[PDB]
Amino acid sequence: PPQVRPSIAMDETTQGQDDLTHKLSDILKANINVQKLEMDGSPQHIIN
Amino acid sequence: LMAQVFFGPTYYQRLRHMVDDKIHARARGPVQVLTRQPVEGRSRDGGLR
RNA sequence: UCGUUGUUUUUUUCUG
Numbered sequence A: 001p002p003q004v005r006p007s008i009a010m011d012e013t014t015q016g017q018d019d020l021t022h023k024l025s026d027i028l029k030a031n032i033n034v035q036k037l038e039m040d041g042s043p044q045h046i047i048n
Numbered sequence B: 001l002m003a004q005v006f007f008g009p010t011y012y013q014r015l016r017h018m019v020d021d022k023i024h025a026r027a028r029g030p031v032q033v034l035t036r037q038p039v040e041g042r043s044r045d046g047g048l049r
Numbered sequence C: 001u002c003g004u005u006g007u008u009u010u011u012u013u014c015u016g
Helices: A019-037
Strands: A008-011 A014-016
Touching: none
Parallel strands: none
Antiparallel strands: A008 A014
16 A cells, blocks of 8 residues: 555655655556557567 | 862863753654654654664 | 644764
């Protein structure tokens, strides 16, 4: 949940993303990306 | 006084570590968001470790 | 109209 990875506040209004948030979002993007290779040209080297 | 005393002027210099800059107490107050524990630092009503 | 909240991250020079 957010508690484990709370959103820091660099200066009042602007809140930065905890490293865990960036990492989870990146893993989510990559997972979506793998899900998108199979539907098109996936020449066994993009996949790898 | 039954004994005598060494006595004279000497060069003494004050130092930056005034007491009021170190005294501190905390009954309750701000807590770290992540851990819900008292914050660190005298200037923020920190808590002793 | 009680209520009423104030950053992290490093590095530094210091104190016992």
